Design a protein around this ligand. Structure first.
Ligand SMILES: CC(C)C[C@H](NC(=O)[C@@H](O)[C@H](N)Cc1ccccc1)C(=O)O
Ligand SMILES: [Yb+3]
Ligand SMILES: [Yb+3]
Ligand SMILES: [Yb+3]
Ligand SMILES: [Zn+2]
Length: 610
């Protein structure tokens, strides 16, 4: 019954398992390097274990020590995106359950895909550099040697030396801070992570950080210039944490801190344990983008406690999380709001399916990533097809109350483990033993393995959506004779959430006649809106509708921030617009060196450059 992580080159969990990592390292901003030792505590699962394989990518290995003595090792040839396999020779055969500790002397490449090294110019303050990591899905290997698979969980401790003037944070509990004693001008920062986690949750940030405390278990961290606003933006965190506890059981990580990164952070959010990372694009000034917060909080259970065993089952992480996320929001804002968000997610799903094509393998809930780079397959599918499956099951089995009971039990049952779609479904049938008959009505094959839209669409309350549809349809079907009647009053009772959904709906039918788009700016002044979601969609609509004036706006948003969600499609749209094509390409080329590494690689691909 063997399950393979086709994304890792390391020895599998059925051979050995890393149980702990002791990391001592220093951050060299001049050399743009991370240097140090990775002491891994490994546990054999086989008798006579004489050698193991670790994952690495662009890693420079100084030495490998075991029991005070250096050991034999090798680096196989690079396997493109998977990096290069590092084989280690054990001086003693190991037997089941026996453990050795391997200390690894390493240096990272300044071109590490897990990292982004920023010049002070690139920072808010302009006087200091900044460094941030991003390991999910498989970039940990780009920072240190490891079994770079979610099927393995370990605890870890780390001490990191950084320039006295800068602050270091990790996805762990801050254990203490002390001056180094080593002919340096560095500080030594300490962290402890008592809960076993998959290595993709390992995270580091170094910079001129300041923090504000916004809850008993929460401080907001960011450069000085973002602190205050962040503090305001995320005010609701603690209340979210409380809901989540009620939904999934106790929060076991201890602290729930937030880190507002610099603009090039590639994601909206990242559930790094004890230190969720978020895009500064969330700072809308009205807390309207807090769902991202609810989301990352939710991972503290679905993802971080119960983890997908391989990236092929990624939907377990994301679909359950979106489900929880939506419940948090429904709890804080209303069931009608939950439904609204759910229906909009279905919309994102329609877009993803249209984009890849309805027969595309990446549209399946359970995928096969053999030979595929996760960064490349990444989409809304696991999020939305996953969420739709859960919503549908909730409706079929009795309701939210009933389904949340299954959810809390599932979390309990699989806490600290890495599992697959089958474990989830086998549990579902077990929990719902009284309803097997209902369960059997679901078309599992289609839902789990068929491409395209789900076999069935759940039911949704239309309360908040109706105004959106009325409005988008009016614009989509408008004639010359309707233009004059549109008016700002049209937006009178629409929340920012509804404006966004209106635009999303409109966008699905782009292009609109240029004259219409112009009228739209004239009556609603969307150019003036700073909310990122709204501007993103508005600008796409504009570009796709061929409005040349929008070119500079689109270029600006695309490069001034680097959240992939916005950056990629803006660049793509601009490249598809004959009028801005050359300039889109040129801008990228000019910006590439200063961009985040994965974003950079994806945009180039998107643009077909290189
Ligand atoms: C759906 C939203 C609430 C937020 C969303 N973020 C997430 O889903 C995070 O929890 C994900 N963990 C982001 C991620 C996925 C795959 C590889 C690297 C990073 C994002 O768009 O950044
Ligand atoms: Yb060297
Ligand atoms: Yb070096
Ligand atoms: Yb008419
Ligand atoms: Zn997520």
């Amino acid at each position: 019954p063997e399950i393979v992580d086709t994304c890792s080159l390391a020895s599998p969990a059925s051979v050995c398992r890393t149980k702990h990592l002791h990391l001592r390292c220093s951050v060299d901003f001049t050399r743009r390097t991370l240097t140090g030792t990775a002491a891994l505590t490994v546990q054999s699962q086989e008798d006579n274990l004489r050698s193991l394989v670790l994952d690495t990518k662009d890693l420079t290995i100084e030495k490998v020590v075991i029991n005070g003595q250096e050991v034999k090792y090798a680096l196989g040839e690079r396997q493109s995106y998977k990096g290069s396999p590092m084989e280690i020779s054990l001086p003693i055969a190991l037997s089941k359950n026996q453990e050795i500790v391997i200390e690894i002397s390493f240096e990272t490449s300044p071109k590490s895909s897990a990292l982004q090294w920023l010049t002070p110019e690139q920072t808010s303050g302009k006087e200091h550099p900044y460094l941030f990591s991003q390991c999910q899905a498989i970039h940990c290997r780009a920072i240190l040697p490891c079994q770079d698979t979610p099927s393995v969980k370990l605890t870890y401790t780390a001490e990191v030396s950084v320039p006295k003037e800068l602050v270091a944070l990790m996805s762990a509990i801050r254990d203490g801070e002390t001056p180094d004693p080593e002919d340096p001008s560095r500080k030594i920062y300490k962290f402890i992570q008592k809960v076993p986690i998959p290595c993709y949750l390992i995270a580091l940030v170094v910079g001129a950080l300041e923090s504000r405390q916004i809850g008993p278990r929460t401080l907001v961290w960011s450069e000085k210039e973002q602190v205050e606003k962040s503090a305001y933006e995320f005010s609701e965190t603690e209340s979210m944490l409380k809901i989540a506890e009620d939904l999934g059981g106790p929060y076991v990580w201890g602290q729930y801190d937030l880190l507002v990164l610099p603009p090039s952070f590639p994601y909206g959010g990242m559930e790094n344990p004890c230190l969720t990372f978020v895009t500064p694009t969330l700072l809308a000034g009205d807390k309207s983008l807090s769902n991202v917060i609810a989301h990352e909080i939710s991972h503290s259970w679905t993802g971080n406690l119960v983890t997908n065993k391989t990236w092929d089952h990624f939907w377990l992480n994301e679909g359950h999380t979106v489900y929880l996320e939506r419940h948090i929001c429904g709890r804080l804002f209303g069931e009608k709001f939950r439904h609204f968000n759910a229906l909009g997610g279905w919309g994102e799903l329609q877009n993803s399916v249209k984009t890849f094509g309805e027969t595309h393998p990446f549209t399946k809930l359970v995928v096969d990533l053999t030979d595929i780079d996760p960064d490349v397959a990444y989409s809304s599918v696991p999020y939305e097809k996953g969420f739709a499956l859960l919503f549908y099951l909730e409706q079929l089995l009795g309701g939210p109350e009933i389904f949340l009971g299954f959810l809390k039990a599932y979390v309990e049952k699989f806490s600290y483990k890495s599992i697959t779609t089958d474990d989830w479904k086998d549990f579902l049938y077990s929990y719902f033993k009284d309803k097997v008959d209902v369960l059997n009505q679901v078309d599992w094959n289609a839902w789990l393995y068929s491409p395209g839209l789900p076999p069935i669409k759940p039911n949704y309350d239309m309360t908040l959506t109706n105004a959106c549809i009325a409005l988008s349809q009016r614009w989509i079907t408008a004639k010359e004779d309707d233009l004059n009647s549109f008016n700002a009053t049209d937006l009178k009772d629409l929340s920012s959430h509804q404006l966004n959904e209106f635009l999303a709906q409109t966008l699905q039918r782009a292009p609109l006649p240029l004259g219409h788009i112009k009228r739209m700016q004239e009556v609603y002044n969307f150019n003036a809106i700073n909310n990122s979601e709204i501007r993103f969609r508005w600008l796409r609509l504009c570009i796709q509708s061929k409005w040349e004036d929008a070119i500079p706006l689109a270029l600006k948003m695309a490069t001034e921030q680097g959240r992939m969600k916005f950056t990629r499609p803006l660049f793509k749209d601009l490249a598809a617009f004959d009028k801005s094509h050359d300039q889109a390409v040129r801008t990228y080329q000019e910006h590439k060196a200063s961009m985040h590494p994965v974003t950079a690689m994806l945009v180039g691909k998107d643009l077909k450059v290189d």
